[PDB]
Amino acid sequence: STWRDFGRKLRLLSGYLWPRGSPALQLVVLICLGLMGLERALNVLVPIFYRNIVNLLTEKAPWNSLAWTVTSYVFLKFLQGGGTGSTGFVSNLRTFLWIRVQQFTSRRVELLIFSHLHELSLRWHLGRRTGEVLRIADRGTSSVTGLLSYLVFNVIPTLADIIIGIIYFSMFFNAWFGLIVFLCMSLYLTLTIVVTEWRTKFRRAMNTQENATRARAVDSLLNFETVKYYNAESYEVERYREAIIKYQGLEWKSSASLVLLNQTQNLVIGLGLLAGSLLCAYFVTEQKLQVGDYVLFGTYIIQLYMPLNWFGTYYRMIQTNFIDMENMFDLLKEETEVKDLPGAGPLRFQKGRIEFENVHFSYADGRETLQDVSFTVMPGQTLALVGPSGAGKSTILRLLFRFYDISSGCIRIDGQDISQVTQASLRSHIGVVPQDTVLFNDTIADNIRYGRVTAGNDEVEAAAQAAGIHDAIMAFPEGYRTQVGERGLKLSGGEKQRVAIARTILKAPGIILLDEATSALDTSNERAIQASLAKVCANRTTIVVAHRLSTVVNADQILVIKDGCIVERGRHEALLSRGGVYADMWQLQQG
Amino acid sequence: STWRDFGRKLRLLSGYLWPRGSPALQLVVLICLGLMGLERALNVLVPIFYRNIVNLLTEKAPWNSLAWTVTSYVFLKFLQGGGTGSTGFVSNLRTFLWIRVQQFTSRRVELLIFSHLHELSLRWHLGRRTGEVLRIADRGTSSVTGLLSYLVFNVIPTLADIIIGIIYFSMFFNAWFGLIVFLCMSLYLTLTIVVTEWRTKFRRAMNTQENATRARAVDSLLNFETVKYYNAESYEVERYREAIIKYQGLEWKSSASLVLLNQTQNLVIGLGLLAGSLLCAYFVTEQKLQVGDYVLFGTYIIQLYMPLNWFGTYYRMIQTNFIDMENMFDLLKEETEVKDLPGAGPLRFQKGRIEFENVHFSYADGRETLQDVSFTVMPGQTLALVGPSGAGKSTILRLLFRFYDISSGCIRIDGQDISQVTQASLRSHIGVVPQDTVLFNDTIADNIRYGRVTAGNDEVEAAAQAAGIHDAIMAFPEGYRTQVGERGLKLSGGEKQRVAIARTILKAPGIILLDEATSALDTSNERAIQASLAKVCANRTTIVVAHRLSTVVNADQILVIKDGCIVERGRHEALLSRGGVYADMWQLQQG
Ligand SMILES: CC(C)CCC[C@@H](C)[C@H]1CC[C@H]2[C@@H]3CC=C4C[C@@H](OC(=O)CCC(=O)O)CC[C@]4(C)[C@H]3CC[C@]12C
Ligand SMILES: CC(C)CCC[C@@H](C)[C@H]1CC[C@H]2[C@@H]3CC=C4C[C@@H](OC(=O)CCC(=O)O)CC[C@]4(C)[C@H]3CC[C@]12C
Ligand SMILES: CC(C)CCC[C@@H](C)[C@H]1CC[C@H]2[C@@H]3CC=C4C[C@@H](OC(=O)CCC(=O)O)CC[C@]4(C)[C@H]3CC[C@]12C
Ligand SMILES: CC(C)CCC[C@@H](C)[C@H]1CC[C@H]2[C@@H]3CC=C4C[C@@H](OC(=O)CCC(=O)O)CC[C@]4(C)[C@H]3CC[C@]12C
Ligand SMILES: CC(C)CCC[C@@H](C)[C@H]1CC[C@H]2[C@@H]3CC=C4C[C@@H](OC(=O)CCC(=O)O)CC[C@]4(C)[C@H]3CC[C@]12C
Ligand SMILES: CC(C)CCC[C@@H](C)[C@H]1CC[C@H]2[C@@H]3CC=C4C[C@@H](OC(=O)CCC(=O)O)CC[C@]4(C)[C@H]3CC[C@]12C
Ligand SMILES: CC(C)CCC[C@@H](C)[C@H]1CC[C@H]2[C@@H]3CC=C4C[C@@H](OC(=O)CCC(=O)O)CC[C@]4(C)[C@H]3CC[C@]12C
Ligand SMILES: CC(C)CCC[C@@H](C)[C@H]1CC[C@H]2[C@@H]3CC=C4C[C@@H](OC(=O)CCC(=O)O)CC[C@]4(C)[C@H]3CC[C@]12C
Ligand SMILES: CC(C)CCC[C@@H](C)[C@H]1CC[C@H]2[C@@H]3CC=C4C[C@@H](OC(=O)CCC(=O)O)CC[C@]4(C)[C@H]3CC[C@]12C
Ligand SMILES: CC(C)CCC[C@@H](C)[C@H]1CC[C@H]2[C@@H]3CC=C4C[C@@H](OC(=O)CCC(=O)O)CC[C@]4(C)[C@H]3CC[C@]12C
Ligand SMILES: CC(C)CCC[C@@H](C)[C@H]1CC[C@H]2[C@@H]3CC=C4C[C@@H](OC(=O)CCC(=O)O)CC[C@]4(C)[C@H]3CC[C@]12C
Ligand SMILES: CC(C)CCC[C@@H](C)[C@H]1CC[C@H]2[C@@H]3CC=C4C[C@@H](OC(=O)CCC(=O)O)CC[C@]4(C)[C@H]3CC[C@]12C
Ligand SMILES: CC(C)CCC[C@@H](C)[C@H]1CC[C@H]2[C@@H]3CC=C4C[C@@H](OC(=O)CCC(=O)O)CC[C@]4(C)[C@H]3CC[C@]12C
Ligand SMILES: CC(C)CCC[C@@H](C)[C@H]1CC[C@H]2[C@@H]3CC=C4C[C@@H](OC(=O)CCC(=O)O)CC[C@]4(C)[C@H]3CC[C@]12C
Ligand SMILES: CC(C)CCC[C@@H](C)[C@H]1CC[C@H]2[C@@H]3CC=C4C[C@@H](OC(=O)CCC(=O)O)CC[C@]4(C)[C@H]3CC[C@]12C
Ligand SMILES: CC(C)CCC[C@@H](C)[C@H]1CC[C@H]2[C@@H]3CC=C4C[C@@H](OC(=O)CCC(=O)O)CC[C@]4(C)[C@H]3CC[C@]12C
Ligand SMILES: CC(C)CCC[C@@H](C)[C@H]1CC[C@H]2[C@@H]3CC=C4C[C@@H](OC(=O)CCC(=O)O)CC[C@]4(C)[C@H]3CC[C@]12C
Ligand SMILES: CC(C)CCC[C@@H](C)[C@H]1CC[C@H]2[C@@H]3CC=C4C[C@@H](OC(=O)CCC(=O)O)CC[C@]4(C)[C@H]3CC[C@]12C
DSSP, rough: OOHHHHHHHHHHHHHHHSSSOOOHHHHHHHHHHHHHHHHHHHHHHHHHHHHHHHHHTTOOOHHHHHHHHHHHHHHHHHOOOSSSSSSOHHHHHHHHHHHHHHHHHHHHOOOHHHHHHHHSHHHHHHSHHHHHHHHHHHHHHHHHHHHHHHHHIIIIHHHHHHHHHHHHHHHHHHHHHHHHHHHHHHHHHHHHHHHHHHHHHHHHHHHHHHHHHHHHHHHHHHHHHHHHHHHHHHHHHHHHHHHHHHHHHHHHHHHHHHHHHHHHHHHHHHHHHHHHHHHHHHHTTTTSSOOEEEHHHHHHHHHGGGGGHHHHHHHHHHHHHHHHHHHHHHHOOOOSSSOSSOOOOOOOOOOOOEEEOOOBBBOOOOOOBBBBBOOOEEEEEEEEEEEHHHHSHHOOOOHHHHSSSSSSSSSEEEEEETTOHHHHHHHHHHEOOOSOOOOSSESSSHHHHOOOOOOHHHHHHHHHHHHHHHHHHSSSTTTTTOESSSSBOOOHHHHHHHHHHHHHHHOOOOOEEEEEOOOOOOOHHHHHHHHHHHHTTTTEEEEOBBBSSSTTTTTTTEEEEEEEEHHHHEOHHHHHHTTHHHHHHHHHHHH | OOHHHHHHHHHHHHHHOOOOOOOOHHHHHHHHHHHHHHHHHHHOOOOHHHHHHHHHHHOOHHHHHHHHHHHHHHHHHHOOOOSSSSHHHHHHHHHHHHHHHHHHHHHHHHHHHHHHHHOOOHHHHSSSHHHHHHHHHHOOOOHHHHHHHHIIIIHEEEEEEEHHHHHHHHSSOHHHEEEEEEEEEEEEEEHHHHHHHHHHHHHHHOOOOOOOHHHHHHHHHHTHHHHHHTTTTTHHHHHHHHHHHHHHHHHHHHHHHHEEEEEEHHHHHHHHHHHHHHHHHHHHHSSSSOOHHHHHHHHHHHHGGGGGGGGHHHHHHHHHHHHHHHHHHHHHOOSSSSOOOSSOOOOOOOOOOOEEEEEBBBBTTTTTBOOOEEEEEEOOOOOOEEEEESSHHHHHHHHHHHOOSSSSSSEEEEEEEEETTOOHHHTTTTTEEOOOOOOSSEEHHHHHGOSHHHHHHHHHHHHHHHHHHHHHHHHHTTTTTOOEEETTTOOHHHHHHHHHHHHHHOOOOOOOEEEEEOSOOOOOHHHHHHHHHHHEEESSEOOOOOSSTTTTOOSSSOOOOOOOOOOOOOEEHHHHHHHHHHHHHHHHOOO
């Protein structure tokens, strides 16, 4: 069960490790593994040369062979680099080469997560805040690369190093030395495991007390006026010092525990070194070992102990790493609510009709739904989606864009149901003029060019001229290519509105879901917007949604939505003659 | 100049180090210094014993003396603990004892800063946000203790260790070995210094690029609706890919530089080890040194090199530490704007009069001042401080509490000018009822007992009964001692208002600067507040400030402030007969 899941997690890590496409990175990782094996050989070979040097000195060896032996050992030591600190040539070269591989896998996972996040639905994005999602994403990617590197380069190589050391001592020394080192490692790890949990128990409550102390301090200083009112400066410093005293007590518990842990580890190392040194001294006394074996044991056992010092640090790090990785996988586990059907054919859009019929959209987490809405819009016409201020208006536009899935009913464009056609093909033929146009942190060229990435500067200039903003574009200080955005030059409502008009001009849509922004910047500017809007909406189909009544006058068909169902339909004079909510609401808003 | 300032800073650190009062901590630090000297002796004594062991093995020494020599060396090694990692008994004991000393100094500096912060003026507190001040304070305290420990225990001891090593090699070996180690340390430090600045230059721009990449990513995801509008998922992942690629390039520059730094240090160590090993091998070949000297040099030179590995880490840490300390000292450099005069005598308050006369308060960072305000309030009277909504009303109350210093004029209470009397004595006889009462995170007992810390539960209950809140206190779920605050049970406007009434009841003031909260919770509750207000204000002098006109009816003297000067003074009927702004504003607010 859980072991099978762990195996799948390991399989996924293995799949992330190997570069599938690049042929050079496969050679890089193969070279890296070779360097790892070589570094293992260096660690076991250095003490043998140190023994050889000492055995040559203890006898009267000539300077000729001694010189080459000493130089060879130092070169061998230079490659190894000793224990922790001052890493050797092989380890540094292996770390230098692994940079490209870890960058490649980090980039691949980052793009996979980002593409998936954009592939989800609108409802999920409204439900969740994006900041924590980005935090989960980056933590997951860092966790994956860090966990992969640590497991392959730090844990397994050293476990092999300890096994090799035990095998060497048991074979080429008396088997007692193999027993001594085995018992030392068993005791060393067992004691570190059983003490670290005790230490972290003390560590946990320290943070909570630290957070509690400063909260009282900042609350004392924030209400400065009341403190001065009642003369409680001495009283509040006394309370602060008492909270400090408690925090100091927790600090002492944690620090004392850490000192005990270090002393226990040092003691275990000392006892193991004592047992080996005395046994080796006895055997060399009785003409069974040589003088070089004493120093070989002394150097090698310390070489074996040094890596184990960081066992606690990775133990408390690997747990956080794994939960972050699981959190990332949980993030990728989500699926799109609104899915494309297996058919997902293109769109047979020739001229473009619109037909709603008995659309009973059950809107989640909201009290505003739509019940029995049904109307048709022929090509080259209008339909004003005016009515009381409710969520049912914009729900129609977002439901026609397939932002939200149908609940009950059918949507027909040119006689084709929109559910079977793919998402992009349907969505490409729809142009929207949002309530508040959004500009990114870039120039004017690539903000107007966002409606179609493949467009030259002449084309975007013609589009700006057609919209009617080119004069302001030229009048801008930096020229046609000024910096406009949240980090750059600010623009007015009409400026961004005509940007969106230019965007939808070069989008070349078939049906426009025009929404009135009704920002009411200037009446003359509003008329200019209307003139440009008639220019961009000429000879096409629009579903104008207006919060005012000016554009409702010219609509061929005019609809009033009674909080989910259409109540009045026809023409403005006909609806004024009907004298429902239309008549008095028009009288109120006209004066 | 700057060196003199550095010397003063060192003197201040020295003053912070030594516990002035506690007699036990002086013994603790003296023991700690002794342990430091002992640890230096251990570091120089261990290799001598290792040489002794090897020289005994190389000859046919009996097992009797060899056993004690080996055990003595291992015990000596256990005390030392070797190099970095697995610290010895002496170092752990020294760290264990230093906890109390660093806690004591950290607590003392923390309380000094907090007391100073409360000792400043209101204007400074309004000007600056408190959160960053707390951050500066805690960073300064941690910087002081961290820098003190590092300088006394890590830099100086090792500088002594290197000097001792050079002296030993020059004296008890040939002086060539002293030259070799001196050249190695000079080259090692010089190369680390000249490479670290180059490395951090590469490191600086990496952070800026990292911040720039994620900003584009999060801006892409925040505007999800527009991305889906224009079909730019592929376009945006491409932009994210390119930004990632640039960040990877900066990462590679930084990582490559670090690898070069490590390789350079390792190579310098190797060359120094090569020179010493070959020279020592030659001398032991020519019957000038013994076989134990070869291992003595090998162990000692590595013992000397190991500490220098962290030179970069403290170099990049000490700079941040010092600037944080300077920032803290800058914070403590500020002085109070409103100071007590050297006289600062008590107050001869017997019955209590109030006299303003030609007070031309020039209010900073504000357009509302007060020009020629002059009125007198006899004991047991009223004075309604009503008028148009301006900052000149509350400025009178805060100017009488001496939050702000006088600018031009005199303030007399019972014929005594308040400037000469001390701050606390004047401020103790004034009771204020603020606009919005503030409650801390504590119980009912110590919230109403905040008006006077020395009070029993019977007294606070009687005060609550007099105010009129005891019934609600009993009705609370937890009883008389419920948890009320921002983290506890919430209370209404009338609840906290009667809390403040109880506070000022047990404050026992002489003159009350009553300010009407006019929260308008309930009309009956407002009448109850008025009845309690008359109960607490009976037979004392009040300067009632009302944003409404109900309490202005009963005032003996009624004032209207014309945005800095009093325009109308007298009684409500007399002012209604004058028929200025009083008459029409009363008619407007009465209906
Ligand atoms: C250090 C020297 C003096 C002795 C050891 C020689 C070789 C063991 C090493 C040193 C540098 C290595 C090269 C450094 C960089 C690369 C680039 C590497 O390709 C990539 O990084 C491609 C990246 C991508 O496709 O995105 C392929 C291996 C290669 C040629 C390496 C092959 C193995 C080399 C020659
Ligand atoms: C898969 C990864 C973890 C790499 C593992 C490599 C080891 C299985 C091998 C590779 C080369 C071996 C070394 C090659 C040569 C020698 C010399 C050998 O010399 C002797 O004392 C025995 C020979 C003799 O009797 O003269 C001692 C073992 C040692 C260091 C070997 C130890 C085991 C090593 C490191
Ligand atoms: C890492 C880079 C900077 C290169 C470092 C150079 C060393 C590898 C060289 C420089 C001096 C050389 C040494 C100079 C002299 C000798 C004596 C030589 O003795 C002989 O057999 C020849 C002399 C004689 O006949 O007595 C043996 C090699 C050795 C130790 C040499 C070994 C190689 C050394 C250490
Ligand atoms: C995985 C790690 C912890 C290594 C553990 C492997 C053990 C099963 C080995 C290593 C040491 C071995 C022992 C080391 C040496 C000897 C001495 C040998 O007997 C003699 O040499 C007798 C000498 C005499 O009588 O003077 C009998 C096996 C024994 C106990 C060995 C039995 C098997 C042991 C315990
Ligand atoms: C001389 C050589 C053989 C080493 C002996 C050193 C001992 C003095 C140390 C080593 C391990 C220590 C123990 C390691 C862990 C614990 C558990 C600790 O309590 C818990 O962690 C219990 C928490 C729980 O699991 O509920 C109390 C101290 C104690 C017994 C320690 C007491 C002191 C011990 C025995
Ligand atoms: C010089 C070398 C040998 C280090 C010696 C240091 C000791 C004097 C310190 C290290 C850890 C300390 C202990 C750390 C924590 C505790 C638990 C503390 O009690 C609890 O917190 C109980 C918790 C529970 O009941 O679960 C009482 C003190 C004690 C035993 C401390 C006593 C003093 C100890 C043994
Ligand atoms: C907790 C860690 C540090 C392990 C501690 C284990 C030691 C206490 C044990 C392991 C092997 C033991 C040794 C194994 C074999 C011998 C040889 C034995 O004498 C012989 O067999 C002589 C052989 C001959 O003369 O040929 C005397 C005891 C002694 C030293 C033993 C004494 C106790 C030792 C060192
Ligand atoms: C770190 C803790 C676990 C203590 C480690 C203690 C060992 C290092 C001691 C205990 C047993 C000792 C051995 C016990 C017996 C002998 C046999 C003894 O030989 C004799 O002269 C008596 C026997 C005979 O007559 O042959 C020489 C010392 C020696 C090897 C001792 C060497 C040192 C040993 C291994
Ligand atoms: C059988 C069970 C109990 C697991 C045992 C696994 C250990 C053998 C592993 C886990 C953590 C490892 C250590 C984790 C971290 C380090 C530091 C690492 O080097 C660095 O990252 C240096 C960082 C620095 O210098 O600040 C080299 C491997 C090493 C010594 C590792 C050595 C092997 C250890 C002890
Ligand atoms: C570790 C042992 C087996 C050998 C070494 C003995 C002494 C060098 C050390 C060990 C513990 C030390 C004691 C540990 C704790 C204290 C408390 C200390 O007082 C305080 O911490 C007072 C704090 C305050 O007043 O706020 C005075 C020194 C003293 C007695 C120390 C004196 C020196 C002692 C006895
Ligand atoms: C103020 C702080 C930095 C402590 C500094 C202490 C050192 C000045 C002293 C204290 C004890 C000294 C040690 C005491 C005894 C010896 C034995 C001495 O033995 C010899 O080889 C010379 C004697 C002889 O000729 O037999 C070598 C120096 C050494 C380690 C001394 C080195 C210098 C030490 C560490
Ligand atoms: C850290 C705590 C857990 C205490 C550790 C105990 C050690 C300090 C003891 C246990 C065994 C002792 C050894 C046992 C036997 C001997 C042989 C002994 O030789 C003799 O002169 C007596 C035997 C004979 O007559 O042959 C010399 C001391 C020595 C190494 C002893 C030194 C002190 C040792 C290592
Ligand atoms: C602060 C650190 C870097 C130590 C620097 C101190 C130097 C001024 C000392 C240390 C080594 C000394 C040198 C080491 C040995 C000798 C050999 C000595 O002459 C001989 O022994 C001649 C032998 C022969 O002719 O065979 C003359 C002094 C000299 C050059 C010494 C001069 C003074 C030196 C450079
Ligand atoms: C064989 C032994 C003697 C060691 C020689 C190793 C060299 C290959 C290393 C050691 C120091 C290195 C240098 C250390 C620092 C710099 C400065 C660095 O550029 C800067 O930092 C300049 C910035 C500025 O100050 O404006 C360019 C590389 C360089 C010359 C390095 C080139 C490679 C060097 C010479
Ligand atoms: C295997 C051991 C010997 C390490 C060898 C690693 C080298 C291949 C790396 C380490 C640092 C790298 C250098 C780090 C930074 C730079 C600066 C870079 O140019 C700049 O950024 C210029 C900056 C300026 O003009 O100020 C060009 C590549 C270069 C020389 C790199 C070239 C490759 C180097 C020398
Ligand atoms: C960059 C760092 C690693 C320093 C490198 C310095 C070495 C290259 C120098 C320092 C001292 C020099 C040595 C100083 C003295 C001697 C002894 C000299 O011969 C004698 O004086 C013999 C004396 C006698 O026979 O009594 C031959 C050269 C040699 C080895 C010198 C060779 C070059 C050495 C090792
Ligand atoms: C790490 C870098 C700086 C290179 C380090 C090189 C040294 C370790 C070499 C270079 C000079 C060498 C010395 C040069 C001269 C001599 C004299 C030579 O004696 C002879 O037989 C020739 C002279 C005579 O006839 O007396 C023996 C080797 C020795 C000590 C050499 C020992 C090794 C030394 C110190
Ligand atoms: C003459 C000028 C160029 C200044 C030279 C000062 C150095 C000799 C100092 C500065 C930083 C020091 C190091 C900074 C940090 C450490 C780690 C410190 O131990 C720890 O804090 C361990 C932390 C861990 O294990 O994570 C012990 C001292 C040491 C080696 C210091 C040794 C002495 C150093 C190299």
